[PDB]
Design an enzyme around this catalytic site. Structure first.
Site, PDB file in Angstrom:
ATOM      1  CG  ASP A  19      43.039 -47.860  32.338  1.00 35.17           C
ATOM      2  OD1 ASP A  19      43.275 -46.753  31.824  1.00 35.17           O
ATOM      3  OD2 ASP A  19      42.950 -48.909  31.665  1.00 35.17           O
ATOM      4  CE  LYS A  76      41.883 -46.364  27.840  1.00 37.88           C
ATOM      5  NZ  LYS A  76      42.425 -47.186  28.929  1.00 37.88           N
ATOM      6  N   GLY A 148      44.384 -56.527  29.176  1.00 40.89           N
ATOM      7  CA  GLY A 148      43.662 -57.295  30.168  1.00 40.89           C
ATOM      8  C   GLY A 148      44.185 -58.683  30.460  1.00 40.89           C
ATOM      9  NE  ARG A 160      63.358 -56.453  22.360  1.00 41.36           N
ATOM     10  CZ  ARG A 160      64.490 -55.876  22.761  1.00 41.36           C
ATOM     11  NH1 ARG A 160      65.054 -54.928  22.026  1.00 41.36           N
ATOM     12  NH2 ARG A 160      65.058 -56.253  23.899  1.00 41.36           N
ATOM     13  N   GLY A 209      49.544 -55.154  29.555  1.00 39.55           N
ATOM     14  CA  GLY A 209      50.116 -56.243  30.310  1.00 39.55           C
ATOM     15  C   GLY A 209      51.114 -55.853  31.376  1.00 39.55           C
ATOM     16  N   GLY A 230      46.544 -50.509  32.980  1.00 39.75           N
ATOM     17  CA  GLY A 230      45.107 -50.682  32.896  1.00 39.75           C
ATOM     18  C   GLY A 230      44.532 -51.593  33.963  1.00 39.75           C
ATOM     19  CB  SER A 231      44.082 -55.122  34.168  1.00 41.95           C
ATOM     20  OG  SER A 231      43.363 -54.829  32.988  1.00 41.95           O
TER      21      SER A 231
END
EC number: 4.3.3.6
Lengths: 275, 277, 278, 276, 275
Positions: A19, A76, A148, A160, A209, A230-231
């Site tokens: 991102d 996005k 986030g 899983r 995450g 992302g973060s």
């Protein structure tokens, strides 16, 4: 044809998609070895922290990212917002991610992705969702944990779940597959295609995450084709060094000695939130 | 495809009445009355309802006696999920198998994989999602089913209106909304779209459940069905032969009230039945 | 001038009358000789349907023909709710009215017959004004405000007649601007609500039905403002059907004359015993 | 008929954007951007949401100032059921009244009897039953409404899809089932049948609620609306004039992705809004 | 006799009664054309905002208001507080309003108003309450919405309720009126008196949330005889101009052109609260 889009996404296998919110972040991502950049208004951690309606980025910013790198550029769009997707396609980017991190625009229907020429990424939390998104025209699936937070727990759970259900399906009595498709609320033909193929019919990346090289290699060892970050890069103390380490971790995911090397002295990770 | 051939064969039944029969005598009555096919089962649904006990596939000897007594197609019933009953029926050489909810369910979670068989299958349904699931499993014909063994048409009306009403909704629906519609029906998307494109069910659709009078049978046709099953209304009535003929004629002439008067006049005692309400 | 208005006009000829359920030609002759304004052909009287169970359907056309041949007064017959083919058959026989009747076994729980598709007038039942107006919009030319069937207990007929007539009275003085919401609350077509307001009465003939067992019961329904009464069970389940039928006819004709009500009630024989469901 | 004439007037706004305005400056900005009409109200919906207080008809003095500042039609909002506010608005000489749920409800049980007025009314709706009830009361135009004052289009999408979806269901429906359908909608049967015959709402239908970007406005048109209202997304944004023009262009050219890119490019800060 | 008090209140029809807390507000009210002033400790908006026990005003303040105007002077007493009412009567004012805006003193019983020589106003929310207050001796009814909010919604609700029930009663089958009186928990004789009269047997003013000329004219078009204004004048930006405009609106309630004139450029209305 859909199969052309599915084949295009195969090229991303083994990669990290990062991102980015501006051209500077995009250059960092490409220099670190990302396989693609993802243009969005704010990183998921900032969307979570600040609130507000999160929409497609301004076309000008997407154009700035597009001319700052040579790797594929994705962007996005809000779920269901097919006009945002029309604009993104007209800009000439390479992929659209119909993303649950942006503010949902249609709570009941996703974009009819088969109406577009460029491939789409969609998220999922389970096999039924993945197959529904595919039938709508997603050429790539992002199996999604928490956005986030820097906490991998939901990504592990959902990876899983998808892979586990695929393994169950592979060995299932053919006669029971009709009821399995009903229970998944997924198209039977795609369920059977997944059963015969033995894996998801499109590329499957993990997301949600991923904060450390260890996290990224974990997703690969669980059987994903790649990872989104992302973060965890741009909310960290050293974005550039951490981005490269995560790229190396995905490339060398079964090499503990390499994983030690790239993780050693990496700086402050994203602190995140324990929900 | 082999499935398309089975689906095409059932088209010959349009405009017909299929009559449940338990022995050779009933089968001869059915054929002479003009039924398009007979349906061999151990007991008529009203008797299964009244007597209880486990209801199974008929003994093969009885199925052979029925098959040799008539020249119209012979169908026979098997318990839901009992694929070995279905193998036996097919090996006898009958024309269709009805995987029927009137018999005692044998598998609560899975129906027969009907694509594994050479002969065509009828299955029941109460709504469009069920119909399309049965078709995907290989049903070549659908019986939209109300109450069994009561002589009360109320649930057949409800379920016929539900199936046909959902098809009409689907026909005009925004294409982008069909994905979620298929999810809500828990039905296969490709079959949902095929139903949308055709404007009708992809296979023959008969009504069943409580058809007791010529008026009931014509009602099912005017609601849009392709034909009707009669399980109990003929052989639990006072004059099975005359009533069987009158119902056949009602389906043939379903849009002709003058004919419907004629065939209904002086028919004798109908099946009394039960009002569950 | 409209086809529906003509149908409404036909049913108006029955004002002041008693309509008697009949199951065969003998009952029909008894009804006409007693002064009934019409006979109603059905398979079994409501008290018998209640006691016996079974699915209750349109009568066999042969029996309807026999009733139609036995009388000169209008002949009505019952069809199950939603069973438009039963109605097509009855109209093809040539009778005068169809009653889409809740006493028979419901055939369609969600929709009634589209009665505008028929040439002959229909009766439908109701328990409240909203229902009456919905039935009228579907094409009913006459409304039967219905209490309990087959019990001989007038209590629910009183309740429902009072409800319909009470809501009609509420309409008379209602602020015009509030009528839109009233129509929504009744789930009834606004134009018919406004027509009811303008007329100060139901836009079609309104009879009472349900539990009428004595001359006093019948006169009560008329004093509450009904145009006539149906008697389903109270005549043919009583000890002297012929005398009670005439007495009830006389009570409806002379409902405001207590002296006449005494005379026609005196020594009338055993009423239908019926059942108190409470 | 008087109602058909009012319905015809509102039809002249098809393809347009109606912009909420609170003063003469916003009104001029709206007209210069190409709005088809201005909507005079006391505060834009986002401010009503953030500030609270009772929201009423604007002072007639402010409406007259807006009315003489522009040549395009002038609308103004009245509280639901406040028929005296509506009498005053009509007497000012404006062109439309919007009986608006964004103002503080004045009658929880009854809307204005709009047939009693000469000028046409707009009413909001969330579903087809409501739309047809408003039309029966005399509304000549319907605003299919999502969330007010949040910049989030989700509820407008939901309600536009709901209205349009029910209209589509009605077109193919067995005529005999329409009576029960009207009961379930709590809507007048004659208006249900008219909608079935037309295959669309019997009056103009605009979308409203959360329209923040040109993409949002074009989305509403591609879903089948006749136009859009913008309440907060222009005047709570960083560049109202340029964003107002971009939204007008997006409605005019809603099926042209190249145009949508051009007018969306470098527009400045949209309204941030709220994700409820 | 009660009928003398009922007749006295007829003189107020077509008028606006204004809450005042001191002599200055009282002069403003009379100069603006109020038909009477209502003396109370604090306007309802201030009682709502500040809390505390709200009681009868000090007699000294009521005397100051009484000698500052020549129109009738009313004052408020807590519900059930018959000694406050005895004091008010002894001061020599013209009406007592047994007011729910003050702090209730008796939760189970109102003042026996027939024990007094001067007429009383009482509030109501429905016809049953109105008739109960009348039977206790109220010579005038205030049909009451929300106090101190500037929101007319509850006044509209309660006015429509009272007037709507009266219209139902007018046409009701006489035989059903006994049960109607039971359901209203109202005296049958008064119910029948209302039925034969065709309106409330005493003057009925609207109150609660009247903030603009439009609000006041609305109450009159719904069939009220007059209006109370508690907060909307003295919580506004220009009390004097607004008071006169509201008086004119009640006098000319069916004249839209006049309603435009009096409303035009009136200043900040009471902002109020949306509950």
């Amino acid at each position: 044809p859909f199969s052309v889009k599915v084949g295009l996404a195969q090229m991303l296998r083994g990669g990290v998609i990062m991102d980015v919110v501006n051209a500077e972040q995009a250059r960092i991502a490409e220099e670190a070895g990302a396989c693609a950049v993802m243009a969005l208004e704010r990183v998921p951690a900032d969307i979570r922290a600040q609130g507000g309606v999160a929409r497609m980025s301004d076309p000008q910013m997407i154009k700035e990212i597009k001319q700052a790198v040579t790797i594929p550029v994705m962007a996005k769009a809000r779920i269901g917002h097919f006009v945002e997707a029309q604009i993104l396609e007209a800009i000439g980017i390479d992929y659209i991610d119909e993303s649950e991190v942006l503010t949902l625009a249609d709570e009941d229907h996703h974009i009819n992705k088969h109406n577009f020429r460029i491939p789409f990424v969609c998220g999922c939390r389970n096999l039924g969702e993945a197959l529904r998104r595919i039938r709508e025209g997603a050429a790539m699936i992002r199996t999604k944990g928490e956005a986030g937070t820097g906490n991998i727990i939901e990504a592990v759970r959902h990876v899983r779940s998808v892979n586990g259900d695929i393994r169950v399906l592979r060995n299932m009595d053919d006669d029971e597959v009709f009821t399995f498709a009903k229970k998944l609320a997924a198209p039977y033909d795609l369920v059977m295609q997944t059963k015969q193929l033995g894996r998801l019919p499109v590329v499957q990346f993990a997301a949600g995450g991923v904060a450390t090289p260890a996290d990224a290699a974990l997703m690969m060892q669980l059987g994903c084709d790649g990872v989104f970050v992302g973060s965890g890069i741009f909310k960290s103390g050293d974005p550039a060094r951490r981005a490269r380490a995560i790229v190396q971790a995905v490339t060398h995911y079964s090499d503990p000695e390499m994983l030690v090397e790239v993780s050693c002295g990496l700086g402050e990770a994203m602190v995140g939130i324990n929900l």
